[PDB]
Point group: D2
Chain length 122, copies 4
């Protein structure tokens, strides 16, 4: 939790996310996707468990990125749900949902699901 | 987008979420779950597309809730990814990921997936 | 389980699925999608719990459809995971994963997730 | 497709799956889980695209396992949706949904989601 999360993280696609974990469970930062209809940095906000279990369990967390910034607007938003595992080789393992705004007829195909693993080393 | 999202919403489980959508894509509010290891209100933060398509597409959005408040700490976080559809009968259709902090051995079973539909009427 | 599952079911998109649940947990039948790159009937195969709990729990089941038949080949496959709830108003509630064959570069966006509810009445 | 899929595969949890891919898109075999409420082998059935794209795209496939055999009955079923990528280092990348039979009140938490990567080497 807290201290260990703040920083720059890289995932397997080459995306970068910089976050600051605040004392009372808030996560704020920017995300830069190495793939998709995206360019530059996007604002992200989220929450994490600031009083995790004192056993070897991970710290649960999640964040959202709406893919609109001053350069592009992909009319979609991605939410990452996962846990932070600290130690020598810290990582954040997540599963994500990317929903695009669609008309009612295409709603059935509006959401993509995947998984990303973030490390402090890339 | 914006104006239409702010308010109190209810989903099919009986949970309540009150949010304020700010001018530049931010969502802030509280969530009260009618089920699970939860009690009272939890803080939520998210993002939405503040410049959605002008055709009949929904507005993409997402938010996160870390299930820790002054009464309980379920060491888990839920992220809702979906879209807002306005009109006579406005609704927010979503899919969610609920991840619990686990030890590495139980990580494979750390995440639940489901779907919630929110209406302004309950 | 068994007897109660065999038949024709319809979901909210208007798709039809006809299945036969065999004595030892097998499900065989055809699926006709009302949406997507599909035409006519596709072969489906799956499994279900043929000795479900005797309390009011649902019967877990799942099936797969590869979207290739004599008319079309969408190079994708959908798997539905859910449970059968019997009674006056029987239904099968499911969540599904639709994966398309992609090149390694586009693998991150290869899978769609959604949910379908099947009834014996349409 | 076809020839390349038949065989024994191992995933990162240490589970084993042996399948035979038949000429017209059928997959039959057994699965042995290294984790969960499981013991020994379970029957699996599925489908795959037997006429995949001739570019470097993966072959889409999916299969289901109902966790009931002669030793145990976990009243749950798992469906794996993914694609087969052949070559020197062949693998099947998947995302899965594990649904447990529950009472209507607990249905919201009936499904787990995860991802498994299978190799011919373990
Ligand atoms: O195409 C879009 O809608 C915008 C870019 C989406 C990028 C995705 S979301 C999950 C995955 N992980 C990343 O770092 N990028 C992709
Ligand atoms: O059990 C927990 O970890 C805390 C409560 C979780 C409640 C869930 S998250 C999705 C679903 N929708 C709701 O409104 N509540 C449940
Ligand atoms: O587009 C394709 O790849 C083939 C058709 C896919 C139809 C989907 S799978 C889930 C959803 N439920 C249905 O009945 N049809 C759509
Ligand atoms: O606990 C159960 O219901 C039976 C065992 C479930 C094992 C799961 S399903 C996905 C994951 N991959 C595996 O090989 N095993 C676990």
């Amino acid at each position: 939790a807290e201290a260990g999360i703040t920083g720059t993280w890289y995932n397997q696609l080459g995306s970068t996310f910089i976050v600051t974990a605040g004392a009372d469970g808030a996560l704020t930062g920017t995300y830069e996707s190495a793939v998709g209809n995206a360019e530059s940095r996007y604002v992200l906000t989220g929450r994490y468990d600031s009083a995790p279990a004192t056993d070897g369990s991970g710290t649960a967390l999640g964040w959202t990125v709406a893919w609109k910034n001053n350069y592009r607007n992909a009319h979609s938003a991605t939410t990452w749900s996962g846990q932070y595992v600290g130690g020598a080789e810290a990582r954040i393992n997540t599963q994500w949902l990317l929903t695009s705004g669609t008309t009612e007829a295409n709603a059935w195909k509006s959401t993509l699901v995947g998984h990303d693993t973030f490390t402090k080393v890339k």
